[PDB]
Scaffold this motif. Structure first.
Motif, PDB file in Angstrom:
ATOM      1  N   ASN A 268     -20.798 -21.107  -3.099  1.00  0.00           N
ATOM      2  CA  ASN A 268     -19.801 -20.042  -3.260  1.00  0.00           C
ATOM      3  C   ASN A 268     -19.780 -19.711  -4.748  1.00  0.00           C
ATOM      4  O   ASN A 268     -19.509 -20.572  -5.591  1.00  0.00           O
TER       5      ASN A 268
ATOM      6  N   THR B 214      -6.314  15.106  10.009  1.00  0.00           N
ATOM      7  CA  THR B 214      -6.093  13.912  10.814  1.00  0.00           C
ATOM      8  C   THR B 214      -7.155  12.847  10.555  1.00  0.00           C
ATOM      9  O   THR B 214      -8.355  13.117  10.632  1.00  0.00           O
ATOM     10  N   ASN B 215      -6.720  11.630  10.263  1.00  0.00           N
ATOM     11  CA  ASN B 215      -7.663  10.554  10.011  1.00  0.00           C
ATOM     12  C   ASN B 215      -8.666  10.808   8.900  1.00  0.00           C
ATOM     13  O   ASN B 215      -9.825  10.405   9.020  1.00  0.00           O
ATOM     14  N   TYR B 216      -8.250  11.486   7.836  1.00  0.00           N
ATOM     15  CA  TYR B 216      -9.160  11.692   6.727  1.00  0.00           C
ATOM     16  C   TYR B 216      -9.321  10.279   6.165  1.00  0.00           C
ATOM     17  O   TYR B 216      -8.349   9.558   5.974  1.00  0.00           O
TER      18      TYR B 216
ATOM     19  N   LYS C  41      -0.023 -11.125  -4.599  1.00  0.00           N
ATOM     20  CA  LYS C  41       0.861 -10.701  -3.524  1.00  0.00           C
ATOM     21  C   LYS C  41       2.266 -10.297  -3.935  1.00  0.00           C
ATOM     22  O   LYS C  41       2.815  -9.364  -3.369  1.00  0.00           O
TER      23      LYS C  41
ATOM     24  N   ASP D 282      -1.638  -1.505  -3.395  1.00  0.00           N
ATOM     25  CA  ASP D 282      -2.541  -1.895  -2.300  1.00  0.00           C
ATOM     26  C   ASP D 282      -3.954  -1.856  -2.884  1.00  0.00           C
ATOM     27  O   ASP D 282      -4.764  -2.751  -2.643  1.00  0.00           O
TER      28      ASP D 282
ATOM     29  N   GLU E 129      -4.532  -4.699  -5.460  1.00  0.00           N
ATOM     30  CA  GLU E 129      -4.730  -6.019  -4.871  1.00  0.00           C
ATOM     31  C   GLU E 129      -6.124  -6.176  -4.321  1.00  0.00           C
ATOM     32  O   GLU E 129      -6.748  -7.216  -4.481  1.00  0.00           O
ATOM     33  N   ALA E 130      -6.605  -5.127  -3.668  1.00  0.00           N
ATOM     34  CA  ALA E 130      -7.896  -5.158  -3.004  1.00  0.00           C
ATOM     35  C   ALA E 130      -9.138  -4.945  -3.825  1.00  0.00           C
ATOM     36  O   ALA E 130     -10.204  -5.371  -3.427  1.00  0.00           O
ATOM     37  N   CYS E 131      -9.002  -4.291  -4.966  1.00  0.00           N
ATOM     38  CA  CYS E 131     -10.148  -3.982  -5.797  1.00  0.00           C
ATOM     39  C   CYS E 131     -10.074  -4.528  -7.199  1.00  0.00           C
ATOM     40  O   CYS E 131      -9.540  -3.887  -8.086  1.00  0.00           O
TER      41      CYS E 131
ATOM     42  N   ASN F 225      -3.173   5.118   9.595  1.00  0.00           N
ATOM     43  CA  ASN F 225      -4.343   5.656   8.891  1.00  0.00           C
ATOM     44  C   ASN F 225      -4.391   5.275   7.398  1.00  0.00           C
ATOM     45  O   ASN F 225      -5.045   5.944   6.592  1.00  0.00           O
ATOM     46  N   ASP F 226      -3.712   4.200   7.023  1.00  0.00           N
ATOM     47  CA  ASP F 226      -3.691   3.770   5.634  1.00  0.00           C
ATOM     48  C   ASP F 226      -4.780   2.709   5.373  1.00  0.00           C
ATOM     49  O   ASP F 226      -4.565   1.513   5.534  1.00  0.00           O
TER      50      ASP F 226
ATOM     51  N   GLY G 255     -10.126   6.941   3.686  1.00  0.00           N
ATOM     52  CA  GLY G 255      -9.800   6.487   2.353  1.00  0.00           C
ATOM     53  C   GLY G 255      -8.413   6.676   1.780  1.00  0.00           C
ATOM     54  O   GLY G 255      -8.241   6.675   0.565  1.00  0.00           O
ATOM     55  N   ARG G 256      -7.412   6.818   2.631  1.00  0.00           N
ATOM     56  CA  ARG G 256      -6.079   7.011   2.120  1.00  0.00           C
ATOM     57  C   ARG G 256      -5.428   5.758   1.551  1.00  0.00           C
ATOM     58  O   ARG G 256      -5.661   4.640   2.031  1.00  0.00           O
ATOM     59  N   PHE G 257      -4.630   5.951   0.502  1.00  0.00           N
ATOM     60  CA  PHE G 257      -3.867   4.853  -0.061  1.00  0.00           C
ATOM     61  C   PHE G 257      -2.462   5.378  -0.290  1.00  0.00           C
ATOM     62  O   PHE G 257      -2.283   6.434  -0.835  1.00  0.00           O
ATOM     63  N   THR G 258      -1.461   4.640   0.153  1.00  0.00           N
ATOM     64  CA  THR G 258      -0.094   5.096  -0.004  1.00  0.00           C
ATOM     65  C   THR G 258       0.695   4.339  -1.071  1.00  0.00           C
ATOM     66  O   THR G 258       1.821   4.692  -1.385  1.00  0.00           O
TER      67      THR G 258
END
Lengths: 45, 207, 190, 221, 221, 45, 221, 45
Positions: free
Chosen positions: G153, G35-37, G208, G46, G49-51, H25-26, G39-42
């Motif tokens: 910037n 539960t709530n481990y 996006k 995602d 885009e973020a990294c 939790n994602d 660093g998950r990515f589904t």
């Protein structure tokens, strides 16, 4: 019941699949549940 | 309340050093009137009473695992015994009291158990005899063990001349220790009463 | 927990005694009906074979748990690899009956035959040990019938809706090591 | 027409633990009644909780004893279901058929000395992390532990806690592991009074949250 | 796509007692009517209860007779469906096709003497537990038994009770069993008056709770 | 009916599975049920 | 009768990507909780885009730099997920496993010069249709482009638009295509002030509406 | 769930088909959705 996992009913009648029990109760479950727990006597925690 | 009096018929036993009664496998009996006796069974209360038997002498030299047994029923010269010879089928449970009288200065421990379908146990199996209905006797605490068991077996009625469902077993858990003030040996006796005695199938006379 | 040991009253102490907390437990895998419900080998076979659960290996998962009970009840499933046709007769049948087709007879269909059989003993329960004679060995009536084929190569049995009564000793391997019995546990290669 | 089906490759073979049932062949069998047959158990762990079985100490004795009244380590054993000392117990007999466990294991201590003999004992749970187990009560005091003396009540029960990195531990022990993975249990005698030939009988049972999972058939057959 | 199925190994072979039906091939057949055809029986035991058949005594006679007026054991037979004496009965003819039975078996005694002949008989059920059957009415009196005399009613019926350790008994008898497992039936003549050549015909039928189970096909074919 | 144990209906119509009876009764059941029981005459139990 | 079925030819074989499940054999397994481990990515995108991950310029540097303050083309690369310059990026690492894509790809420019160094840059998207990429900011001005200078910037992000004839483009590049099919990205330095040894770090992320479709397993195994 | 496309339920119970999760939790979806967009500062369009 025990190690059977079909969601669907058996194709055969129960009178054929198994023998049938007649009539005219879990002792160890009761024995275990009756066990003493905690402490006997006064506690200074 | 370490004081207990047990009554079976016109016989009683009173002990002042008891640790209670252990009921094995059940607190009541299965149904005594089933199809196998066609309603011809009857109860014999005159047989439900104490009879006595010496089991053995607990001495310092007997080591852990030393085991003594008594298959039941045993030879009985009273009413119960007569039933075994006069009726083809019987069933009964047992009210068992075992005493080992030394004094409080003796040390050691005996395991008293009632075992269904006795088979000679191997040395390794003796470590698990507590799986059977039992109590212990330790001179520092009690002189009496008391176990009550029902009748059981693959058959609802039995022919005791051919099969003994229950066996009383006494095993040395820790050897008897002695002092200058203790007893030197302890004689172990059994006080047994058959319970709920039912018989079926009266036999002919032998003369 | 302090108690009177001699009375043999069960006593189950917990970690709460010294400030711990007892957890949730899931015991389906030690459920009796479940654990006995799987096929095990019989091994000593002949073209005519009486089904006796006591012919399971005494250290096998099912054979050992079965011997750790005095009395038991169950229905049965069997898997048989045979040459010729397979005939089964219930408990009590004359051995001679095995030769006739009027008794449940399964015609060969590769690779083997699987059948569901009911309990047929005349006793309300059977036993794994029996202290006496019927005329140590067990009484002849403690069986699930018999099977016959030209040749019986393999036989597997499975206890269905099993019931066990009166626990008896169950032993792990004896240890010579002086600390722990050690063995090769499966681990990834390289 | 009739229903078309795809007989699928890789499916259909017999699996010894499959969750399906065989086809029946002999119907309408009614069994003799076995209503209220005594002594039934439906879960192995009910039996394991209720019936403690004996541990095995040097020489095959279910007890420890000491002749000197000084403080001593009476016994030390691995917290393993495969430990020499647990080898004749029912708990280990059951555990051999499962790959993993978690939860509490209970130890029972029953003093069998005479009325005139007294003793004071200590039991400690030593987790993994040290080379060797502590040889004195003083070093072991820093661990989770209980101390008790003999008296009217002859039995003392202590819970060996499940403390581990993973949520489950293996029931068997590997040839590669030299020092035990779950730690040790150490039994000490703080001191005694005239208890030279008197013993402490030790037995073990399953605790309330003790659990076994993943059935296996490991013995040589 | 279509439905995927797993053709399962170990299933599908023909079993001679299977509970399924074959595929049909010739439809719409209407039968000649057989409404109220007489003499139907839907259970073998209905016939067995209603129609007693004769026992067989030394020399193939369905009766016993005695020339002396002293008390005598007239016949003794095993309580077995495989007994010599029951070998020509319908009850045994049916029983051979089942492995087990339980319940009451009824014996019928019909006196065929002339009006001027009288007798008094006794039948006893001797359970297993004795070496040999009792040879006198006196020893047998201690068993379950009935005594009757001849008169206007020529027939007497007695129920042999099912008394056994197990709930069912085997219909066949094994080569190993020397003394009969279910006991004996002993027929005695207490005494008679001028009945030297007069006989007692014996037959047997199934009782109300008589039951047969587990069909078998045992005869050599 | 007799030695058939499928919980599920037959895939084929009854007119095909079996022959069909026409019309225009258990004698031994009645005969057996009509049997005398007990005692004839007076009883001193 | 029983159900008739047509076992159909051409169906039933194992296909490594089939949408069905196997038959189970070991039931009732409960897992340790997770539960709530963290660093998950589904979805891979995602993360994409973020990294942003670094581009690769001549000599394996994630940046460009120029010693002269004149206007220069600092770098030119193919708008291809198989471009040399994108070869060490996470976006290309993911893209190799899909046959097609469409959508925005984002470039990030981070100036790492000291406070006393200034620069003005230009990035242009050059579509397919010309022989060679423009070598000057002046010729490239006629394309879609952005110009920016360094200041407080340090980072500037620019979207490379998806402009193509088809709705999707191939992620891999064919041996036959000489000039790149999706065009070029050209990075220029308009001019700088005392920025001779200062660099511009370039990284890339998914936009996006960036999308990848049709999974493939192309690497030599 | 993921690369399974039968319209029909599985013949076997879920307790058999898969292991079962327990609770006590994602992150990248949130991280991506939190990204800045548009322009920083004044615009003269």
């Amino acid at each position: 019941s025990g190690n059977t996992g079909s969601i669907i009913n058996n194709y055969y009648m129960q009178q054929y699949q198994n023998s049938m029990d007649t009539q005219l109760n879990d002792w160890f479950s009761k024995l275990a549940s009756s066990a003493f727990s905690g402490l006997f006597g006064a506690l200074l925690a | 309340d370490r004081i207990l009096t047990t009554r079976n018929g016109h016989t009683t036993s009173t002990t002042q050093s008891s640790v209670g009664v252990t009921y094995g496998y059940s607190t009541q009996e299965d149904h005594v009137s089933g199809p196998n006796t066609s309603g011809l069974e009857t109860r014999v209360v005159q047989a439900e009473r104490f009879f006595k038997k010496h089991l053995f002498d607990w001495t310092p030299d007997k080591a852990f695992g030393h085991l003594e047994k008594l298959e039941l029923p045993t030879d009985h010269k009273g009413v119960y015994g007569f039933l075994v010879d006069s009726f083809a089928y019987m069933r009964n449970g047992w009210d068992v009291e075992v005493s080992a009288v030394g004094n409080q200065f003796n040390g050691g421990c005996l395991l008293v158990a009632m075992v269904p379908e006795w088979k000679e146990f191997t040395p390794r199996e003796k470590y698990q005899l507590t799986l059977f209905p039992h109590q212990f006797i330790s001179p520092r605490t009690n002189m009496t063990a008391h176990i009550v068991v029902p009748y059981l077996g693959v058959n609802r009625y039995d022919q005791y001349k051919k099969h003994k469902p229950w066996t009383l077993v006494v095993m040395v858990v820790s050897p008897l220790t002695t002092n200058t003030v203790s007893a030197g040996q302890i004689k172990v006796y059994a006080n047994i009463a058959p319970t709920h005695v039912h018989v079926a199938g009266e036999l002919p006379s032998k003369e | 927990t302090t108690t009177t040991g001699e009375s043999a009253d069960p006593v189950t102490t917990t970690v709460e005694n010294y400030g711990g907390e007892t957890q949730v437990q899931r015991r389906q895998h030690t459920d009796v009906t479940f654990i006995m419900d799987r096929f095990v080998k019989i091994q000593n076979l002949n073209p005519t074979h009486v089904i006796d659960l006591m012919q399971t290996h005494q250290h096998g998962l099912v054979g050992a748990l079965l011997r750790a009970a005095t009395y038991y009840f169950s229905d049965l499933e069997i898997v048989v690899r045979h040459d010729g046709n397979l005939t089964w007769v219930p408990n009590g049948a004359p051995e001679a009956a095995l030769s006739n087709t009027g008794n449940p007879t399964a015609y060969l269909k590769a690779p083997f035959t699987r059948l569901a059989l009911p309990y047929t003993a005349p006793h309300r329960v059977l036993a794994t040990v029996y202290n006496g004679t019927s005329k140590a060995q067990l009484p002849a009536s403690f069986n699930f019938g018999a099977i016959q084929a030209t040749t019986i190569h393999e036989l597997l049995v499975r206890m269905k809706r099993a019931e066990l009564y009166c626990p008896r000793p169950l032993l792990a391997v004896e240890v010579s090591s002086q600390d722990r019995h050690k063995q090769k546990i499966i681990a990834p290669a390289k | 027409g009739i229903v078309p089906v795809a007989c699928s490759d890789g499916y259909g073979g017999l699996v010894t633990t499959d969750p399906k049932t065989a086809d029946p062949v002999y119907g309408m069998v009614y069994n003799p009644p076995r209503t209220n047959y005594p002594g039934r158990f439906t879960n192995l762990l009910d039996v394991a909780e209720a019936c403690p079985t004996f541990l095995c100490f040097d020489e095959g004795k279910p007890y420890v004893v000491t002749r000197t009244d000084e403080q001593r380590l009476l016994a030390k054993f691995d917290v393993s279901l495969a430990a020499k000392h647990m080898s004749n117990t029912y708990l280990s007999g059951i555990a051999q058929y499962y790959a993993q466990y978690s939860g509490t294991i209970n130890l029972h201590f029953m003093f069998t000395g005479s009325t005139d003999s007294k003793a004071r004992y200590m039991v400690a749970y030593v987790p993994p992390g040290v080379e060797t187990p502590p040889d004195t009560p003083e070093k072991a005091a820093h661990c989770i532990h209980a101390e008790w003396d003999t008296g009217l009540n002859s039995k003392f029960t202590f819970s060996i806690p499940y403390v581990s990195a993973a949520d489950y531990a293996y029931t068997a022990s590997d040839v590669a592991e030299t020092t035990n993975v779950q730690g040790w249990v150490c039994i000490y005698q703080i001191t005694h009074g005239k208890a030279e030939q008197d013993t402490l009988v030790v037995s073990v049972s399953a605790g309330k949250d003790f659990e076994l999972r993943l059935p296996i058939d490991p013995r040589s057959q």
